[PDB]
Design a protein around this ligand. Structure first.
Ligand code: FE
Ligand code: FE
Lengths: 167, 383, 510, 383, 76
């Protein structure tokens, strides 16, 4: 449609009106989790707030994070995910799935979702980074193996694209 | 055939140039918000060099990056730290150091040090240092310590790649180079000694073994490995290493141990080196203080938020260093008991000083409650 | 023993490798398919004090020349206006490549396990800070003495407005820090500095001194002196991973991906900025490119690494095809969309044309005709209300941005080797322009989600976009950028506004 | 309208310039006789600048001066010294210092010193210095000593006007500035202290009184006034001040007293300053040694001749300094007796070192017989 | 008292006049019909370290220009 100004438009305004209403950490965690499944990664639900999601997300991150410092006890901020899950458990879990992945297309989804679900402030910074890092090495290895094997035509179909035009 | 000095070309360019300026704003990046009274050159050449987008507090660009890591980790992102802020650019190093001023200064230190060394050897001033201090303490435990500095230097690699602003970046990098310098300089004194006192083994074999297996440096090696490899939150690495670990144990080891006791065992060589490490410390301090106290701990919107993590990290890492110190005070057992320096009380005031400054230098600025008395007692137990 | 003795830097460097110590957790933090050897050795025995000493000396001579001699000569206003304007983009764009390198090389010092190896990178880390501040100094100085300081005084903000900025970001920002340290390494060191920067920083001083610019040669001649250590850092990267079984599988894959990334933007952009941002030509780009890429690099530099099971990129032949016309294809897109820049352009004059047709037979009949056509249409006159982008649209020539490289594409006027592929995926359309990036995107959909200028500016009138992004000068009405480099008839917001240019979604017809 | 960048003028000059060089000798003053392997820049920019005529050994001009003093004293003449030589230009400073290198180095020291000072105060390192050392000794007798340096600095004015060669001139002048620097720096430490320890009077009133009326500095003041005002033979001033007086008493006072005892009374501030004075000493030494040992004491034609006067001056001035020292060793009475430094034996090795180095550094080079043992005994009598 | 403080050149220059001391033989060696006052004051408060610092800076810019820029221009 018609675009509005980059850094100030009705969309970021409205989501901010929304974020403002969150009050519980539980509350804030579902919200941000729903927000990232719906709007981030090429496997996003919607592409509607495409040019505004990243700013909005950051604003939600802020709300969640502030909430945690004033509600969860200090220890939890270090030892666990906002979901009440034990940070190491989550790490153990996802590093297990990725290792169990049988294809690159299977590997990518595990990595992409881990982020949507656990990007800080949901998961502690130190925990998220190493896990993200560990998942990343696997995906890369699964992927860079025989990289030029499949022809373009084949790749197009494995990706499941709707080829609208070839010159 | 250059256009400036070639008749036919200079003439041609002369005709193309307009008689008047096409704008009067001549301040390079005039839109930078000055910290001081008017825009500095340090600011003008540093501020906004990092292409951050609006979704990262402070940045002026827009859109997503053009290439992320596999899985989507952003080139730079808010996942790198738990600390939040109104503008990541807010940071200003009190020294206004950009690359030029920084190497210029060190270059002075570089050359002066070699002049001083050539004279000192011609001076034969080595003749009166205490042989035990020289051979047993200096050569071994002072050598060992280079590994503490080297460790801290290394805990900056990821910081260097992960921080969210240019100024912090430079503050971070000049910090790292100063630490590898300390390491390099401690060895330089060791090598100079070898050239002067025959049989003095300046190699790192013994100081290396001591670091990794000698109980005196046990807690330190513990803290260091944890700061270096333990975490990736770039603010946590910066805080814990400089504001806590070095401010305490490092400062105690350098100023209170080696430099102080050097001026009691008649050692006129070591204070020359410690002068540099101690100056370097104070310089990083101003930068570290601005970033954490001014910028972070006092961010209008996230002060209390960041302080939660600051006080958290502080309680964790201070405990680690109290232990580091407790292991360190075992070294006193190997020195001559000078009445009032290497004795219980002497050593106790050394601690008093350390914990006492840290309390006004860092603690009180961030709202961390510390009972200096208790911490001295704590360290002293391993005496 | 009283004899004058000191300690030499190489004496100190002798113990560096023993500075590191073992412990179960002493490993890199970044995701990577490689493992750099632990006893890898560095090539230059430099140390801290020595680093500072070596660089400061350079600094002193450089700053004496600009600050002292050149000011006295009134040199900053002796450059030709075209070149003076090109230096806004050249210096600021580079500044970013220098900038991101500080971070990239830090990731590399993190990757390395050998003390010595981290040392070389750390050296590079300091070098990159120096070069960022040097690139800023060029625009800073130009702000002070050039006839047009606007653009030089704010590109770190005015670059965000137009398309060319995004490409530069891919090669010299994202390509250096996002991904496998090694890919980031090949991207920066082995291809970036080794194939491009290094010969580029020298070629720029040639194009500069030739157009009355003595600011740039003063600064860059200094820069290139530190770059040799960087070429060495790439070299050491391969070496440290040469006995890693992974390398046999992965290395060459990353190297070809890294190489195409670099050639994609650089091939067309530098040729464009040289040939069009100059009045006095130094040598034609097509010839330069074959000596840099085809010969010096693929030929000589790469061969020296062949003993590591490292080969010439498989995309080299594809690159070569493009080198002739790709930059002229870009020129059209650049001139056409001139109001989104922060620099004053100039159409190729009656003689620039002659040089063009002489060095690229066929240029005239195709590019020449369009450029002249636009000149008649009122390209430079603010009263014409004419913008080449609208003429592009009206005559069926659509501009697409490649979802991977960001490089613009006009298939209907393109003479280069690329082509369009528009795919739909999860509800989003994407324009790809070559086989290599199409594969990159097909395989790594989530590493490539960068919004484009059309996606962002859709349905907006060009002046509104410019005013919002600050493309105006001190008076807040007159545009920094211009279609001519004269000192009268400067276009304003109203002028732009009268053309009624509104951004369309080029992918809506598919 | 400059000729380099003005089209019409650059064009005009372009036509006037010849296509080839009109001579190929491009070495500036290629006829200078190199000391080292090839001509240095220090040589090229210094040698033959003084317009001496052939009647003054070494000079290349001819004729009398164009204006003398009333009565006929030459602008420069052979009456200025008793020492004769084959060429007055023969002298080369080992440091090859011309004006640039010289200020460049000091400029480094200047800036580094202010960095160090700003850190040291922030470091609070003053807290552990011995109060007696600080208040009683340092503040008074160390202050007093600036007057020794200042005296030596002044004994160079006539030298500066009367020496017969350019190199000697520069060696002479850089020597003088280094001495006034010492004086200025001793006071700087005194002023820094005042800013840190309240009530510390950094003024010169007391140190001044001590110099002029305190018996500890009696012999020194005697020697100094005699070197400064006593004579005008420029070589005698140079020799006596640097090679004898400073090499002995000065060196003893600075290195053996203040710097050494600073590293025993826990003083981490003074060695910073003495590092400069001690380096400066060693630099002048090389110059002084070249001029007197290489150039003069060993002149093929007048070696034995000049040595007659050298050994003469040496016997006279050494006696003066033995006395200076004998007065100086009275200060020990005011310090805490550290077993092995401030006691008879401790102090005796200090002397041993001094007289012992001087014997190999200067004595033996000029054929002066000195029984180090006797001189130590001599000084020690006033202990 | 931990606060960053240094000593300024004018602070040092403040004690220079007291550096000289009296003694019957403290007089010029040259023949002259004049006697310069003993409390005469200087106009620029410079000192050694400061002298060096001030000049070197000049030197740096000068030598950068000739050695670097002008050579590159073929100016000579
Ligand atoms: Fe660079
Ligand atoms: Fe580089």
């Amino acid at each position: 449609a018609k675009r509005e100004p980059i850094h100030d438009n009705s969309i970021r305004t409205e989501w901010e009106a929304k974020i403002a209403k969150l009050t519980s950490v539980d509350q804030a965690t579902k919200f941000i989790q729903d927000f990232r499944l719906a709007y981030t990664s090429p496997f996003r639900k919607s592409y509607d707030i495409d040019v505004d999601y990243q700013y909005i997300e950051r604003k939600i991150e802020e709300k969640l994070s502030v909430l945690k410092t004033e509600k969860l006890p200090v220890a939890d901020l270090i030892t666990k995910a906002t979901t009440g899950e034990d940070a190491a458990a989550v790490e153990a879990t996802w590093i297990a799935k990725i290792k169990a992945a049988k294809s690159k297309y299977e590997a990518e989804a595990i990595h992409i979702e881990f982020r949507q679900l656990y990007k800080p402030p949901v998961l502690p910074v130190n925990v998220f980074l190493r896990t993200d890092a560990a998942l990343g090495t696997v995906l890369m290895e699964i992927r860079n193996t025989d990289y030029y094997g499949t022809p373009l035509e084949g790749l197009r179909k494995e990706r499941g694209v709707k080829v609208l035009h070839l010159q | 055939k250059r256009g400036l000095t070639d008749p036919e070309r200079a003439a041609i360019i002369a005709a193309a140039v307009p008689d008047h300026a096409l704008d009067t704003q001549r301040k390079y990046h005039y839109f930078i918000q000055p910290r001081w009274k008017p825009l500095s050159e340090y600011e003008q050449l540093s501020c906004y060099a990092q292409p951050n987008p609006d979704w990262i507090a402070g940045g002026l660009d827009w859109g997503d990056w053009t290439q992320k890591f596999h899985g989507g980790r952003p080139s730079w992102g808010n996942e790198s730290t738990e600390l939040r802020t109104t503008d990541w650019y807010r940071h200003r190093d009190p020294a206004r150091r950009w690359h030029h001023p920084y190497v210029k200064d060190k270059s002075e230190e570089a050359r002066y040090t070699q002049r001083f060394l050539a004279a000192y050897s011609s001076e034969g001033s080595i003749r009166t240092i205490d042989p035990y201090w020289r051979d047993e303490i200096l050569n071994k435990y002072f050598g060992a310590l280079l590994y503490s500095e080297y460790g801290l230097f290394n805990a900056h690699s990821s910081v260097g790649r992960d921080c969210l602003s240019d100024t912090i970046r430079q503050t971070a990098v000049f910090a790292a180079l100063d630490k590898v310098d300390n390491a390099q300089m401690i060895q330089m004194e060791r090598l100079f000694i070898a050239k002067l006192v025959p049989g003095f083994d300046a190699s790192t074999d013994v100081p290396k073994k001591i670091w990794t297996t000698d109980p005196i440096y046990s807690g330190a090696r513990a803290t260091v490995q944890e700061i270096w490899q333990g975490v990736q939150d770039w603010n946590e690495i910066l805080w814990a290493g400089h504001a806590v670990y070095d401010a305490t144990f490092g400062q105690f080891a350098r100023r209170e141990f080696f430099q102080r006791l050097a001026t009691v065992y008649g050692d006129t060589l070591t204070p020359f080196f410690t002068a540099q490490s101690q100056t370097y410390f104070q310089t990083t301090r101003g930068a570290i203080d601005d970033l954490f106290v001014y910028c972070l701990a006092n961010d209008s919107e996230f002060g209390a938020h960041n302080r939660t993590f600051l006080n958290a990290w502080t309680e964790h890492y201070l405990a680690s260093s109290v232990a580091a110190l407790k292991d360190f005070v075992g070294l006193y057992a190997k020195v001559e008991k000078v009445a009032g320096a290497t004795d219980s009380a002497g050593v106790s005031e050394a601690l008093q000083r350390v914990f006492g400054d840290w309390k006004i230098d860092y603690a009180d600025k961030i709202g961390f409650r510390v009972d200096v008395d208790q911490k001295v007692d704590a360290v002293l137990a391993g005496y | 023993n009283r004899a004058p003795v000191g300690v030499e830097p190489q004496e100190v460097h002798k113990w560096l490798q023993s500075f590191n110590w073992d412990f179960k957790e002493n490993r890199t933090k970044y995701p990577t398919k490689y493992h750099m050897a632990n006893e890898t050795k560095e090539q230059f025995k430099v140390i801290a004090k020595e680093y500072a000493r070596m660089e400061a000396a350079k600094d002193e001579r450089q700053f004496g020349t600009l600050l002292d001699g050149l000011t006295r000569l009134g040199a900053g206003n002796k450059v030709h206006p075209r070149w003076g304007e090109t230096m806004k983009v050249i210096s600021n764009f580079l500044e970013v490549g220098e900038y991101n390198a500080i971070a990239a090389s830090a990731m590399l010092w993190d990757s390395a396990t050998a003390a010595e190896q981290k040392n070389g990178y750390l050296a590079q880390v300091l070098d990159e800070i120096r070069h960022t501040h040097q690139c800023a100094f060029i625009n800073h100085y130009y702000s002070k003495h050039y006839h047009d300081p606007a653009g030089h005084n704010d590109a770190r903000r005015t670059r965000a407005i137009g398309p060319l900025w995004k490409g530069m970001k891919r090669v010299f920002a994202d390509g250096f820090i996002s991904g496998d340290a090694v890919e980031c390494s090949v991207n920066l060191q082995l291809v970036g500095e080794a194939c491009f920067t290094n010969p580029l920083i020298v070629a720029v001083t040639e194009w500069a001194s030739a157009n009355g610019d003595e600011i740039t040669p003063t600064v860059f001649l200094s820069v290139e002196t530190d770059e040799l250590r960087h070429m060495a850092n790439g070299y050491q990267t391969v070496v440290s991973i040469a006995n890693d079984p992974a390398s046999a599988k992965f290395l060459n894959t990353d190297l070809n991906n890294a190489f195409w990334t670099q050639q994609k933007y650089f091939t067309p952009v530098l040729g464009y900025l040289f040939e069009y941002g100059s009045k006095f030509k130094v040598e034609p780009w097509v010839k330069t490119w074959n000596r840099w890429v085809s010969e010096d690099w693929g030929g000589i530099w790469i061969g020296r690494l062949g003993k590591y099971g490292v080969e010439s990129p498989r995309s080299l032949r594809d690159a070569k095809r493009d080198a002739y016309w790709a930059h002229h294809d870009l020129a059209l897109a650049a001139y056409a969309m001139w109001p989104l820049g922060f620099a004053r352009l100039a159409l190729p004059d009656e003689e620039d044309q002659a040089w063009f047709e002489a060095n690229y037979p066929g240029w005239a009949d195709h590019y020449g005709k369009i450029f002249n056509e636009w000149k008649k249409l009122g390209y430079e006159d603010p009263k014409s209300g004419f913008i080449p982008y609208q003429w592009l649209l009206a005559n069926g020539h659509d501009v697409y941005i490649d979802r991977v490289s960001q490089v613009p594409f006009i298939p209907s006027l393109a003479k280069g080797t690329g082509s369009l592929r528009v795919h739909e995926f999860n509800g989003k359309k994407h324009s790809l322009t070559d086989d290599w990036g199409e594969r990159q995107w097909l395989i790594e959909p989530e590493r490539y989600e960068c919004h484009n200028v059309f996606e962002q500016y859709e349905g907006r009138e060009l002046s509104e976009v410019i005013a919002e992004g600050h493309g105006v000068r001190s008076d807040g009405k007159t545009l920094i950028a211009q279609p001519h480099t004269r000192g009268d008839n400067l276009w304003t917001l109203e002028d732009i506004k009268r053309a009624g240019c509104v951004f369309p979604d080029p992918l809506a017809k598919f």
